[PDB]
Amino acid sequence: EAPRVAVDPFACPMMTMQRKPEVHDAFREAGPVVEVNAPAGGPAWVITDDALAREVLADPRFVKDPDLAPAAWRGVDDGLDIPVPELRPFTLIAVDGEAHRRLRRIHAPAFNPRRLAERTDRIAAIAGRLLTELADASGRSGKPAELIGGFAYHFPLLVICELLGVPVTDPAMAREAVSVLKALGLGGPQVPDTSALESLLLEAVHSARRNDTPTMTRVLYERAQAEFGSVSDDQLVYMITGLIFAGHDTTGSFLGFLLAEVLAGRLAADADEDAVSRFVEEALRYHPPVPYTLWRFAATEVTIGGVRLPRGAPVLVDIEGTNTDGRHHDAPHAFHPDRPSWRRLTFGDGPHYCIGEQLAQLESRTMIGVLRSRFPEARLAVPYDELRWCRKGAQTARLTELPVWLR
Numbered sequence: 001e002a003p004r005v006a007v008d009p010f011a012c013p014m015m016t017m018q019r020k021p022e023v024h025d026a027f028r029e030a031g032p033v034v035e036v037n038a039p040a041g042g043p044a045w046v047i048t049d050d051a052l053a054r055e056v057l058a059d060p061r062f063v064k065d066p067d068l069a070p071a072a073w074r075g076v077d078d079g080l081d082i083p084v085p086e087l088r089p090f091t092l093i094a095v096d097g098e099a100h101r102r103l104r105r106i107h108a109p110a111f112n113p114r115r116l117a118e119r120t121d122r123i124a125a126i127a128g129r130l131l132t133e134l135a136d137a138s139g140r141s142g143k144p145a146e147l148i149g150g151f152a153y154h155f156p157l158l159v160i161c162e163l164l165g166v167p168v169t170d171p172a173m174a175r176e177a178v179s180v181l182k183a184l185g186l187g188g189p190q191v192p193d194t195s196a197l198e199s200l201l202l203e204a205v206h207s208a209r210r211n212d213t214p215t216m217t218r219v220l221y222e223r224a225q226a227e228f229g230s231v232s233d234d235q236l237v238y239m240i241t242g243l244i245f246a247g248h249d250t251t252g253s254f255l256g257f258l259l260a261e262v263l264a265g266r267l268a269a270d271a272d273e274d275a276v277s278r279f280v281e282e283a284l285r286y287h288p289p290v291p292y293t294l295w296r297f298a299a300t301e302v303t304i305g306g307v308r309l310p311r312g313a314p315v316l317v318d319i320e321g322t323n324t325d326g327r328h329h330d331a332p333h334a335f336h337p338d339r340p341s342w343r344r345l346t347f348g349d350g351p352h353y354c355i356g357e358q359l360a361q362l363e364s365r366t367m368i369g370v371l372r373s374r375f376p377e378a379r380l381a382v383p384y385d386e387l388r389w390c391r392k393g394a395q396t397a398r399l400t401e402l403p404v405w406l407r
């Protein structure tokens with residue numbers, strides 16, 4: 001049926017900043033829907049057309065249900081996001097239908113952008129502390145500040161933890177713990193001492209239960225309880241565990257790119273607000289951290305751009321590819337903020353759209369304000385052309401490193 005390209009779509013060599021993997025162009029040229037090799041055995045189909053993928057993502061026949069995935073995938077493609085049956089109703093990514101509408105109704109007031117905005121200053125603070133520290137340390141050592149390990153993940157982590165009421169002192173270690181928690185909770189084997197974080201997560205929940213203070217975590221607790229009749233501490237810890245993982249790991253991947261672009265000098269020195277939000281917009285087009293959508297499966301057989309897809313056909317949208325489509329974007333592998341503001345799929349589409357878009361963009365804009373207002377001379381300590389980025393399977397794209405002189 002479909003044009004077939006016999007490769008892992010997740011394959012990814014060491015990459016330079018300007019290029020995207022060639023698999024992407026292969027798929028596109030082969031057609032709107034392309035059979036490829038899934039990492040964990042068996043076929044998979046990849047969409048390459050913006051318009052098509054958008055319909056697919058609002059099409060109830062394409063579902064998250066991890067139980068439709070191939071048996072060979074279970075306990076071997078940690079790219080498969082498979083909570084145990086009884087937590088799936090608390091996992092946004094693993095449901096559709098009313099279970100999903102419910103979770104969405106639960107998260108939406110918690111992510112109220114009025115209330116995100118009210119904490120701009122707190123977020124600037126976080127950025128600045130981190131940046132000062134890395135600067136102060138760079139002056140001491142004489143070595144450049146490595147912004148990936150140093151900032152890109154610690155910044156969004158602290159932000160998202162703070163909004164939930166989760167007091168973190170060691171961002172490096174909270175990251176390791178929350179990563180493990182995530183792994184276990186999305187189906188994975190078997191000592192990152194998660195108990196530490198768990199303790200703090202449980203504290204936020206506890207705090208949320210007893211205090212009418214409208215935290216993010218309290219709003220969650222209120223909506224869950226009304227929707228579910230009754231919610232448990234372990235349930236609320238579980239959900240927020242997921243917000244922390246997503247809130248830091250995807251964002252941080254992105255921010256490393258955004259930084260590299262800012263520090264390379266590609267944003268004009270006197271950029272208005274709007275010029276900045278244009279630069280961010282473009283970096284989100286040009287450096288999506290998530291290559292393809294999350295695993296979706298055909299719930300029946302379906303025929304989609306003239307191709308006929310079996311029951312349980314593993315389907316992906318190509319985010320990286322669609323965003324770098326010569327056809328819909330003039331000079332797609334060039335970085336042009338002033339581009340005629342067009343659509344992208346970096347945050348996805350349809351009922352499962354990223355609920356963090358606002359936050360991630362807020363974080364992005366604010367970070368650039370801190371940098372140009374307090375670190376005006378911050379510059380790459382190596383050439384942009386020598387930077388390199390990579391991803392191993394289902395992991396977000398990220399730079400190997402980002403050496404910087406912050407002042």
Ligand code: HEM
Nearest residue numbers: 092093246247250251254293294346347348352354356360
């Ligand atoms: C640059 C940053 C981010 C990017 C690029 C990103 C990307 C995406 C994408 C593509 C989806 C949809 C997945 C699919 O349908 O296959 C998604 C969903 C989601 N995002 Fe993000 N995300 C980002 C930041 C954040 C942040 C900061 C948070 C939370 C604090 C967050 C939380 C979520 C959650 C909970 C979902 C699940 C949606 C659902 O299943 O209804 N994200 N994101």
Ligand SMILES: COc1cccc2c1C(=O)c1c(O)c3c(c(O)c1C2=O)C[C@@](O)([C@@H](C)O)C[C@@H]3O[C@H]1C[C@H](N)[C@H](O)[C@H](C)O1
Nearest residue numbers: 079090091092093182185238239241242245246250394395
């Ligand atoms: C215990 O964990 C959870 C409990 C309740 C809800 C969730 C989770 C969870 O871990 C969880 C995630 O990890 C992720 C998302 C997400 O929304 C949840 C939950 O909704 C959304 C994101 O995919 C992006 C796109 O924002 C980030 C992340 O998905 C992970 C694993 C996935 N294979 C892929 O590598 C992606 C880059 O990263």
